[PDB]
Amino acid sequence: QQEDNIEAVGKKLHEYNTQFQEKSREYDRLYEDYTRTSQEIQMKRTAIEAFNETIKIFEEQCQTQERYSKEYIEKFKREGNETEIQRIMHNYEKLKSRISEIVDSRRRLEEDLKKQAAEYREIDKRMNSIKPDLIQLRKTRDQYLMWLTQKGVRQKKLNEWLG
């Protein structure tokens, strides 16, 4: 209605405690990376919003350039000043070519964010594979420790095995 020797059990307490501590360190490494990568992903997504607002301002400027230039391109054409129109339109082309650089820069960040999003999921997967081992090694350590406390082993002798 409800078994090895004490020295042999204490040996296994030392082994299982070492295996637990190693896995505890390994998880703390992966959790550090999980913490770190979460900050980096947020920064990247905040930077993409910045890219968007930058590009938004450039597109507002392109709207301003087309609306404002309608009056003066016509006026300089009447006065016979085709050279002033050439300055205006080439400047607009110089504005447009800069956007292509900023748009190209935004795409690189989006691709790094895609690669870093995979790594986040890969780390979290590696964490969730170790949790079974870590939780079980905590339980096993505790059960052997409680077994020896029942058997009546001194606290000083348990500390040697735990270390």
């Binding site: 301002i57 301003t64 350039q65 300055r87 205006i88 870590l134």
Partner: protein
């Protein structure tokens, strides 16, 4: 030192050319106009002062850059892109809104992007409330503004010493004798007659924003008390009320159907394919299950698992309490355990409406811990902000009526809530000194508890059955007519066990008695409790904001407690919104915090330079390479001239660059020294470790010092400042004129002869008493708090004689957690006895001090327990479970009597004296 900047003119024209990073915006605008004249459509532009630059700042917001004395490197635009726009409209709100975003470390657009009514109504209500108080502050007088800005720093509460008085502008000073117990109106009158040979002036300490005024005597001020005890003469200044104004200007119970929910789908799960996924679920109120924990059927491990299951609980819809939370947990079992993630959800919303429709809960990852529970009901209700990457569970609360249904009002609850000597003897035994039989007894005698046992309201709330709506209404009926409890009891009611909104409201109602002095002692604890709050708009948040607007110092420390956890995703939203409201109601202090932020921003970059240089080059070269980075115009101006984060009355004026340095530690702590018209002040900028642990300990030592000082016992402690400012970053106050024990010793009379050099002749007998008093206090403090890992490297002594401890890494038994014994070092006992092998008279005083100290803390033992209990919110490893709180119960020995506890303390004292020789 140069960068190519895109310029966008309001005619649509685009200029592009290099400028220096150190060059300010006003200078940049002049170079722009000089190149704009050689580009089309120049004639149609107005003058440069008609326009203002706009950039995209680091938080991805447009910022109208009104202050053109800012350097482009200090502005920190995302890409080097400036755009000219019209300098008109409501520029006041525009300037503040952008300056807030940078200051809090979060863009205000991120609050808008959520499209959340709860957020928008918080912003609406709190900003309006805060703006009104700031307006009302300005209409009020100069004396009241002085109370707000520069509140009285007093000691916890007959001689005739000199005092060097001065006036604003004049170089001459006046030294003359004045008594210790005089009221400062008299002190001004004496100096005012000396000017010729009252109510329109106020006194001020030199090189400080600490003002002497009000009904209190001169002895109760910290500046005076420090000057009397040390020996030096107070140096004051007489400021006029005009100069102060210059600073001021310049139905639910119907629906009896059982509760249920549709578990639809999971998203973005990352687990081992061999296993199968299970969704554990359960309802909660505080840290108590309302019903059984329902579980789902098993599905194979993929990214997008599907269930589509009904999950019926054993509780009715009518029976649910106000603060009911559906707590989830995603696991990974084997078909015939692994916690992946968890998420909590409040059944009723902030407006009291029961939630319906689909809810996409973005889950938090599960950490394995010593408890190892199924669910995590103590966790935050707010969803994970990393939405696109992190996992989630699609669920759906079903419809239960044609129209929606609310949780009943206070009126309707009161209506439902209405209606021997043997059992009364049993109630005494339970409360004065809980099991299932005791719970039903107390609930039966709940009316007698209200009448005869007001202090045990907390006990009555736990025994109440929150899963039955009948029991809830009866408890709330009693609560709304419950008599006002003291501070000490009210602090207990703020804990995670008491989630109910009426209970919180009662707890805050009792805390309105707090003085600003006493509130400051519990401010850290009160900040941490906000993690347990469910909704954003709450009484504790309002209470904290009320006091911050009332008192500038409280507001200052409220800012940095909240700001320092903006990196933490679980509180970034909640804290960010409070910091917004605070900022709007204290625009004057915003300017101060902006200097502090940018000073701290440079010290990070300065520490990172020193960290990289320490690996490559040696220390003497790196120390010189540090000063070059400091001496640059952007770095020097930002670090120079600001109020200290550690104490905003203290003025950090001139950076003494040559005196600055760094230690060769794990995290390489910077040592910044200052000098101002008073004398010297220093700080340590630590980046790498978390300083909350060290702060909490220093706060509790400071609390002991106050508690001892209230009982007529000044143990000459050194509770120096410690302030977390950010992500593993913070300042720490330099205790000047001091050194570590290791550096002094590196034998028998090592510390004794150190005191002889620093206190020769008559001062020696004073410094020993300073040592004896201080050592006693720190012996008792470290004992009670359970502080291990003490040694020569982390213990210090001042030149005046006071010993003090530093850098508290571990406490409450931890190092595995065992009882840390009482520790008396042979070297300290040698100094206490004045170089003698046996000196029973002096050692008996020292024994007396440690006993008197220890007894005083037992009288206020519940305070320490209640405060430490609330700090569990902070998620410190060494202060997590109830056994950590138990350490304090045993060390103070509150279960035992005052005689019994003191007899046990003497045995631990006597055993420490024996262990000193060994």
């Amino acid at each position: 030192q140069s960068v190519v900047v895109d310029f966008l003119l309001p005619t649509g024209v685009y200029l592009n050319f290099p400028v220096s990073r150190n060059a300010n915006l006003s200078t940049i605008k002049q170079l722009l106009w000089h190149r704009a004249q050689y580009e089309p459509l120049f004639h149609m532009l107005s003058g440069p002062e008609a326009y203002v630059f706009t950039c995209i700042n680091q938080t991805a917001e447009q910022q109208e850059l009104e202050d053109e004395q800012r350097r482009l490197c200090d502005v920190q635009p995302f890409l080097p892109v400036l755009r000219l726009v019209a300098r008109e409209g409501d520029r006041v709100k525009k300037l503040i809104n952008s300056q807030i975003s940078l200051l809090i470390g979060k863009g205000l657009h991120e609050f808008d992007s959520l499209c959340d009514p709860e957020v928008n109504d918080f912003r609406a209500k709190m900003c309006q409330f805060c703006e009104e108080a700031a307006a009302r502050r300005q209409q009020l007088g100069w004396e009241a503004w002085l109370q707000y800005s520069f509140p009285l720093q007093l000691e916890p509460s007959n001689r005739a010493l000199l005092v060097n008085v001065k006036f604003e502008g004049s170089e001459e000073s006046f030294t003359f004798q004045v008594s210790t117990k005089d009221v400062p109106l008299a002190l001004m009158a004496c100096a005012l007659r000396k000017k010729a040979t009252p109510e329109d002036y106020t006194l001020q300490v030199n090189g400080r924003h600490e003002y002497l005024y009000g009904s209190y005597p001169l002895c109760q001020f910290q500046y005076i008390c420090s000057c009397l005890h040390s020996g030096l003469t107070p140096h004051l200044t007489m400021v006029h009320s005009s100069s102060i104004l210059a600073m001021r200007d310049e139905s639910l119970w119907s629906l009896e159907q059982p509760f249920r929910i549709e578990l639809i789908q999971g998203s973005k799960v990352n687990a081992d394919e061999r296993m199968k996924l299970v969704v554990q679920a359960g309802l909660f109120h505080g840290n108590e299950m309302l019903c059984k924990t329902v579980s789902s059927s098993e599905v194979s491990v993929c990214s997008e698992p599907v269930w589509k299951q009904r999950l019926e609980f054993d509780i009715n819809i009518c029976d649910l309490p106000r603060m009911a939370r559906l707590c989830f947990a995603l696991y990974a079992v084997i078909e015939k355990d692994c916690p992946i993630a968890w998420a909590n959800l409040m059944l009723f919303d902030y407006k009291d409406q029961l939630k319906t429709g689909e809810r996409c809960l973005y889950m938090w990852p599960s950490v394995p811990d010593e408890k190892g529970e199924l669910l995590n009901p103590t966790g935050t209700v707010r969803s994970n902000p990393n939405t696109d990457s992190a996992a989630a569970l699609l669920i759906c609360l079903p419809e239960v009526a044609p129209h929606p249904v609310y949780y009943p009002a206070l009126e309707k609850i009161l209506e439902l809530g209405r209606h021997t000597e043997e059992e009364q003897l049993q109630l005494r035994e339970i409360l004065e000194r809980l099991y299932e039989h005791e719970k039903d007894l107390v609930w039966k005698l709940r009316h007698e508890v209200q009448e005869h046992f007001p202090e045990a309201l907390a006990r009555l709330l736990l025994v109440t059955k929150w899963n039955k709506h009948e029991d809830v209404a009866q408890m709330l009926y009693l609560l709304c007519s419950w008599p006002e409890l003291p501070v000490l009891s009210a602090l207990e009611l703020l804990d995670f066990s008491f989630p109910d909104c009426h209970v919180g409201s009662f707890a805050i109602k009792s805390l309105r008695k707090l003085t600003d002095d006493e509130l400051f002692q519990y401010l850290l604890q009160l900040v941490q409790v906000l993690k347990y709050e469910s909704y954003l708009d709450c009484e504790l948040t309002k209470f904290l904001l009320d006091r911050a607007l009332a008192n500038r110092k409280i507001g200052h420390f409220l800012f940095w407690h909240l700001r320092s956890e903006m990196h933490v995703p679980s509180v970034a939203l909640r804290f960010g919104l409070i910091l917004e409201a605070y900022c709007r109601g204290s625009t004057h202090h915003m300017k101060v915090l902006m200097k502090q932020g940018e000073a701290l921003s440079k010290l990070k970059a300065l520490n990172d330079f020193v960290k990289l240089s320490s690996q490559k080059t040696p220390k003497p070269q790196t120390k010189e390479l540090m000063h070059l980075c400091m001496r640059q115009e952007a770095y020097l101006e930002a670090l120079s001239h600001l109020q200290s984060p550690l104490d905003p009355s203290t003025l950090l004026a001139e950076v003494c660059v040559e005196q600055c340095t760094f230690m060769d530690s794990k995290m390489k702590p910077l040592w910044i020294m200052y000098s101002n018209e008073e004398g010297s002040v220093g700080i340590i900028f630590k980046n790498g470790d978390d300083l909350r642990q060290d702060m909490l300990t220093l706060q509790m030592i400071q609390l002991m010092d106050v508690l001892w000082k209230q009982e007529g016992l000044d143990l000459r402690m050194t509770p120096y400042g410690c302030l977390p400012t950010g992500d593993r970053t913070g300042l720490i106050e330099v205790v000047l004129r001091s050194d570590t024990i290791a550096n002094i010793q590196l034998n028998k009379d090592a510390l004794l002869n150190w005191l002889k050099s620093k206190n020769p002749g008559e001062a020696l007998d004073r410094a020993i008493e300073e040592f004896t008093l201080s050592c006693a206090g720190y012996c008792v403090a470290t004992y009670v708090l359970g502080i291990g890992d003490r040694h020569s490297d982390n213990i210090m002594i001042r030149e005046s004689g006071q010993l003090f401890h530093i850098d508290f890494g571990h406490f409450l038994g931890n190092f595995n957690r065992e009882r840390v014994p009482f520790i008396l070092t042979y070297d300290f006992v040698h100094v206490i006895q004045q170089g003698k092998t046996n000196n029973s008279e002096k050692f008996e005083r020292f024994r007396g001090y440690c006993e008197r100290a220890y007894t005083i803390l037992r009288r206020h033992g519940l305070l320490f327990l209640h405060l430490f209990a609330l700090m569990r919110a902070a998620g410190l490893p060494e202060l997590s479970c109830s056994k950590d709180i138990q350490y304090l119960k045993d060390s103070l020995a509150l279960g035992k009597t005052e005689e019994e506890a003191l007899k046990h303390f003497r045995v631990k004292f006597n055993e420490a004296l024996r262990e000193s020789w060994k």
